[PDB]
Amino acid sequence: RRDWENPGVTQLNRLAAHPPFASWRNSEEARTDRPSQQLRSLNGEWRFAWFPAPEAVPESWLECDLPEADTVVVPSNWQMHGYDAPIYTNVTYPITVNPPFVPTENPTGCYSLTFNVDESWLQEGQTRIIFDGVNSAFHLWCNGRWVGYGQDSRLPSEFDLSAFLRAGENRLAVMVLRWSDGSYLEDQDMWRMSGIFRDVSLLHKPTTQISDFHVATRFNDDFSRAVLEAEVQMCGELRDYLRVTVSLWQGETQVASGTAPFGGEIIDERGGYADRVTLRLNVENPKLWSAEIPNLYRAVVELHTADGTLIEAEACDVGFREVRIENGLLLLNGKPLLIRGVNRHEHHPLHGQVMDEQTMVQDILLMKQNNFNAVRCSHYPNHPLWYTLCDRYGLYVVDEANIETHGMVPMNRLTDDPRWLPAMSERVTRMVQRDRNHPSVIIWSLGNESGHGANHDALYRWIKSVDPSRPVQYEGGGADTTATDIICPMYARVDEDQPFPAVPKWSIKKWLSLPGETRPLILCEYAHAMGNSLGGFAKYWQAFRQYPRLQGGFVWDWVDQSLIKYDENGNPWSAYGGDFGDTPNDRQFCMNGLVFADRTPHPALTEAKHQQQFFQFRLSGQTIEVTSEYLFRHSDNELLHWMVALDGKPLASGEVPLDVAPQGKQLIELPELPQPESAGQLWLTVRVVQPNATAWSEAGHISAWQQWRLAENLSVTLPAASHAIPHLTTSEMDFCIELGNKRWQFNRQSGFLSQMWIGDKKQLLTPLRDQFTRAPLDNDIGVSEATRIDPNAWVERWKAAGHYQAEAALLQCTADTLADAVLITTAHAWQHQGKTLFISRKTYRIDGSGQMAITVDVEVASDTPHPARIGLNCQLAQVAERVNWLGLGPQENYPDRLTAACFDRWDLPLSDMYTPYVFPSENGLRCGTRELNYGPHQWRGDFQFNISRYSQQQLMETSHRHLLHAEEGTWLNIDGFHMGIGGDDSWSPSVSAEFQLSAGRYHYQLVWCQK
Amino acid sequence: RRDWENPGVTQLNRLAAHPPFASWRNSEEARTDRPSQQLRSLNGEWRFAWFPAPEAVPESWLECDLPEADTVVVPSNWQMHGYDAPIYTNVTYPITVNPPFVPTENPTGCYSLTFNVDESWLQEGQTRIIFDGVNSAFHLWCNGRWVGYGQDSRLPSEFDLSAFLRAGENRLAVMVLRWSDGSYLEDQDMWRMSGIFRDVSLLHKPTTQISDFHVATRFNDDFSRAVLEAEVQMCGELRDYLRVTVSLWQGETQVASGTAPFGGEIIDERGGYADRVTLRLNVENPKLWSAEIPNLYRAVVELHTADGTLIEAEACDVGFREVRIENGLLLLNGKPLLIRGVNRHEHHPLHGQVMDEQTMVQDILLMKQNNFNAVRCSHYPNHPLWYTLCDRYGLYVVDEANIETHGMVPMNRLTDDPRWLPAMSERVTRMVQRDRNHPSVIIWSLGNESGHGANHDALYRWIKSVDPSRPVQYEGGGADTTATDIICPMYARVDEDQPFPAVPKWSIKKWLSLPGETRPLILCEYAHAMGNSLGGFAKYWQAFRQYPRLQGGFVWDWVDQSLIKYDENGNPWSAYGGDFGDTPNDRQFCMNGLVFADRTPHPALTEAKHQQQFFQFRLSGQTIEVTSEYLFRHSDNELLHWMVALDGKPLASGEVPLDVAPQGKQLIELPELPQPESAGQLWLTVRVVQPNATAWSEAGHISAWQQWRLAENLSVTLPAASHAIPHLTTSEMDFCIELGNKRWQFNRQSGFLSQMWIGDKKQLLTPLRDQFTRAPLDNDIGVSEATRIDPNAWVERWKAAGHYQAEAALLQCTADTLADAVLITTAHAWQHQGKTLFISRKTYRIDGSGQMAITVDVEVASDTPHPARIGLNCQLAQVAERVNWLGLGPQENYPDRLTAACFDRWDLPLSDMYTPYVFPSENGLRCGTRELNYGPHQWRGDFQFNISRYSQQQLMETSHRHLLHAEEGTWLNIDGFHMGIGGDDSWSPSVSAEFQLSAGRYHYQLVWCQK
Ligand SMILES: [Mg+2]
Ligand SMILES: [Mg+2]
Ligand SMILES: [Mg+2]
Ligand SMILES: [Mg+2]
Ligand code: NA
Ligand code: NA
Ligand code: NA
Ligand code: NA
């Protein structure tokens, strides 16, 4: 038969889709969501064995536990237990392309479980089982009898067990296949696993019962009145005594109650639905549900007789809300939304694709914590608890059908074929049937990266038809096809057009005004958070902010899909593509997250928090202007703390409770701010504080901040004549500078300061040389593999030009004795194949103060690529536990990424001065640095630096962070200038011209002193 | 497994759908539609065996042919050879409703066929099997081995046989089942049958072959230029040298040619379609296909190599045409159409549901000869040939998904269910894929009577998505749902509303003007033509002519769906519902044609013909104004005949050839028309004649005609004195009048003309008495059974009023002698259960002239139901061969059905005065009769009459027309007045007020005499 190879057989004997039931027996357990006794978890230890093919499975198996069968926990992913490898392929299908045929070698997993039933369940009512998540397909036998078949790994499969079930002991036999024709629709850029990864349960429902029910909430102009309307459907023997009651609860307060009997109104010629009923409850001044204040009534549906006898009950949480596109705009509850969002996969580093309440909530807090308001179920329906939690905590949700044919050719190859309609069809409807009643769900998605076929069109309209409460979006075939209510491109740039043929990506700004165009624009994907990323994220935030029809988007993505591995010794290490021996694999494109798989923030995470703050500020001299981005709430837990400091010295602070309405303004007037008996930079800094604790935030939680330079006083002081003076020892190839205990040596042949002594002690491990390169970022690399070169790749360019192989050439080197200092002169050329790429002209002026002042003058050939950096490097001998600087911090920060960084005096352990990106690259850069203090040293200027125990060479040459070793001393990279990082996408250049080193001439002056 | 009880499984291993194929191996043959050697028909003598169940089938059967097995022909309809009963039920599913289950008792048909297969087919390429029609599901085996499964009775199921064959003797085994879950989607108002009811064929295909192909014809603003775009797909091995050639032929002239290699344009990110190519051919000044003129080209598709080697060819007839809805109007080739449509079921009285070229062509000719230009495919896809004939003969076509759930509750019960989507989807999809290339198909339709559900919505879009050349239509749940391009109601009335809840039927005029509304309006069905029917037809035509957005319709319906049964003597007769035991059955509802099953015309047909005329005529004095309703053709085969006659005596005739352009006029002035010798009514008549023969018309066929009473010279002449006085002889038993050999006997007890002699010859069999009733037509009865009284039925009303039982009471009866004549004066009263319905007052005046003159005065209770009629009747003793009158004719004509009738002297056999409606009723009617002659008798006044050897009693009591025995003598009915027959619908009163006998006072006069 081989159903798993038939697009036309996607299930056999699978019950109908519906919202989550619990068949509660008491209205109160119901109203309270107390656990239902009619709901039984089959989770725990299960019996299990593996076979390379299903053909290989022993018939005994159906009748009796195999011997060699191990015990495992379920849910779980069999790759997680080590039965076979998990594959990390993005686009290219993990199997060969032959629809609709899976391979002969199809890792089949036979799971089994022996359990008991209560004789009570079998006398009356209906008993059925549920599988919430089976990857990818499966057959099912109970008590040696063949139950049925199911396809689609992200939606709930249920079968009626009533007829196989017996008193007490029963046995379940579950035959799981990895590959199935279902697979063709599941081409997701993620680890490819398999198994019983979701919850198995048992539900006992009465013979006569609740088959389904939907809930919808219609309002009035101003939303002062509303109507909740419920459609209840029943199954089983229909009797005139049979009644329904829908009650609406606000805690312990009944808000409304409705009672009726079955019998629909006339729908057509044949009549109406007798097994149906629609109640309409009016609610006065309803509490509106939103991501900002998730007001939530609770609805209880009860099937019962005219006599009061309660047949059974079901329930759900109700959110009063209206979602609508009107006049080119998305409305929430009548106000125009701003999507501060994020894509998220359900992923656990140890657990595989198994999801737990704990993880779930972790994510959510953090999410909420970060100025986030929406999540995108990229790209299959999520674990059911999730909707609820969002509904609960308050996040807007994009529920996506589980469909992605990315690997096809072209993409719409399946989706444009009728033969695949059904299959796809089953994938959209069921989600819908299941997820309907959840307020958090605000928009529907047809899936991902599967072109644009007629199949989309239909399903689009099907939705449209059954659920008009929400908009449909779909990006494929152009982000603007007829199967989307919303212009939802991915990787679309702010200003620049990506005119691909057929599927051009237009600047989002330009995109909205195309002749004919009128829809709202929301990015399904944008700001690829791959490694050292999110550069120019602000450039999006700005646009959004300015463009009304630019209603935001969802960052890609939330958390790194990294896996836990263990070495010989037992230390756990973060794994990725081709680490499990998976091939083909897509290396690290599985790591795009804003946080590490441990829910540990990436430094870009702050940049998002920052640009997604809900308070905006302007400063008019002494006046502060706070503006509200809340659509619905009042600044009722915010207090403004403000402060003024001088180059880090706080000349004043103060706090001011904010009292701003949504979308409103507040005027805060600062008290005259003292003058400064000194030179330097005046800076005023502000922060919003959440004095109290929320269900998501802590008390004293920081919601936003902003900072400006108030004024600056120039240093017109003239040193102080040097008491003592520096001495110069000329040698045949050295230049000695001695003063105090201190002394400098400049090797006359190389042209470089080669050694620094303070006392008897040597300060350098490595001379101090110029630098034009960086250890390549994921961004810089792209899809440049060692086997398939991307010539446009920044790394590629640099490589090919010899940026990384230049030979500096001593052009000049002189010593000179001034009246007050010794004057050192150098000049180098960096060449390659006789091309002079760079020329470096320095000066060192050492004076009696024991101060070394380096002056740097670079020239960059017009015809060569632009260098990642322009700075100096050397390896320190010293190795100190803290780093101290006057500058932009405290987190890592680059030129096209630093709007969140604040200017201050910073203190942290040398350690925190490194960012363990699993795939090593340039990192922990700190910008606009005035002062850097490390051990006995002091650097003074305007530069960006970095300091770790790892040479660039080492980073560049290492693949996994857990392979790095600290080196002797400390690596100190000091840049006069640093190149942008990019982020728009990670498989083509994302660096804005303005962040590129196009000048051709650079100037920089450092100060090298000793404290 | 039981696939038949699963909407999930609708096929297994069935191949893709595609336009018709023959895999020609030589272009000339393809070009010339010559028969392809690679197409093998397996129609013929087969083997058969029937079982009540599948379970009853013997294993043996797959390997060996049973002995009890019979030899039947294929295609065949098993109940035809009478293995089981054919059921005639309308709405009521003919099995218990329990989706998706069908009865255990499910009659199964065993078809086995042994054939030869040439080795050459086996060597190279693919040999597939095609089943054009199999009712209602089936399993497939070849050479013992199970091949596959298929559901849907109206479309082709294709299987690859390449693996199961062997050179020579091969054996097929087909297990066909009456019921499946398919059956739920197939509830049409027709005989429920089963079997291999359509052609079986063998295709042999190259391994590298054309797999599908699409054709499209685009134009310029005036259609002076066009583009042909051919999309071709191929299956098989892709090689650089493969080529495609699309040549266009107009006869033997190669209009255009295009050659290209495979490999389509970039579709998306993944790329394009390597396995396809779209060519584009420019046709200048293209001849345009229309129902008026079917300008066709031939498209030749070649799959060959770079080197000229033909691989295979495919082909199709191409009609350059543009169908579109602009500004609320349907336009064909830039012109708004007028549909003169008819619904068509595929039915043969002998063959059941089996079509043959013969029957097809005959319907079509007939159709065209009758002013029909389009056909709706009621309610599934037709025999593949049908299309080709329409493309060729010139008919517009509505292609219709085989989807009907009429017998569900509500109707949309399945179609609003996601689970059935699939099943439905493939029924729309596949139809589209097959018929896409035919020009005759101008509109798609999603089925019949299935309410309105979301699945309609989806498939609607899909279609639109895939074929935009044509509109979609669907009447379900309202006729103006979101799923329809055209407002397509069924049975909506010209001016009266039918405000059904949920789904009102507005007046077509009104309907169009509803707020919001902008669509065109075509009735999917109007004019129920059930037996003595089609009254009020003009009323639609008038309308369609006045209202731009009223685009015409499709009358219901073509042919009576009766079947021949045989009598003891082996005499054929026509059956209907339950005349086979079918239970249940909807009796005569299966008969609604314009023609009899044998293709013999019902009299209503002429009225359709006439209102559907293409030339419209106006008279102004001596001027004729002709108008062409041809949109595209010139009156290039028509000449107009005109004639003047005096009370049927021709005084002038002529011919004039029509020179009228589309939508143009012609004026025609007539010579003088000599003053008349006598007195009476001058009539002018014009007719259109096609002197030349067509493909569908014979020579000198009449396509149009019209009459106009010009003048009237009233008679002011007095009777030549009586040269004899009648003698009145009284008695107590009766009054006696005598004059010569002639005598009249009036009964004084009864008050009626009991007897008459001329000579010694009695003239009457039954006395001349008033008549107030008719033998209820189908229309009169409705859906009223003798087990389910539908009170509103006219007949029920009549009955309950005892119009059929009223007993006449004699009030007065007197004689009197005038100077010149005798005067008999009467009065009766029909009463019933105490009420006085009618009051009938008369005068008989016999004079020396020997003329007896009846003057009648009727009073009708206001509060009683309007009578079917008001005349007299009597049984003549004479029985004659001809009938001669001067009035409307020569065909049967009723008050609300008489426009196509003509006023003249007519001569016909008695045979022709009876209209043999299978289901007997009042019939025969000829109105506006001024004089009537039968035997030696002459009646003269202004009445409508009827005359046959069948009393209304008999008719009113005989089910089959075949049970009528001619009574002794002639039955005569002379109505002063008759009620209209209605027929807008046949299940409610359709008789318009202007046609109801409402006045309450009726006056009439007759003059009886001898020839
Ligand atoms: Mg399958
Ligand atoms: Mg992908
Ligand atoms: Mg089935
Ligand atoms: Mg019907
Ligand atoms: Na905006
Ligand atoms: Na690296
Ligand atoms: Na019209
Ligand atoms: Na019918």
PDB file of C-alpha atoms and ligand atoms in Angstrom, chain A residues 776 919-921 955-959, ligand 6:
ATOM      1  CA  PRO A 776      35.596  37.492   8.855  1.00  0.00           C
ATOM      2  CA  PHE A 919      31.323  30.651  14.967  1.00  0.00           C
ATOM      3  CA  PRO A 920      34.224  32.814  15.782  1.00  0.00           C
ATOM      4  CA  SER A 921      34.722  36.232  14.118  1.00  0.00           C
ATOM      5  CA  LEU A 955      39.630  33.476  15.307  1.00  0.00           C
ATOM      6  CA  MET A 956      39.704  33.436  11.632  1.00  0.00           C
ATOM      7  CA  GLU A 957      41.277  30.002  11.606  1.00  0.00           C
ATOM      8  CA  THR A 958      38.891  28.428  14.210  1.00  0.00           C
ATOM      9  CA  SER A 959      35.358  27.186  13.527  1.00  0.00           C
TER      10      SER A 959
HETATM   11 NA    NA C   6      35.980  31.961  12.534  1.00  0.00          NA
END
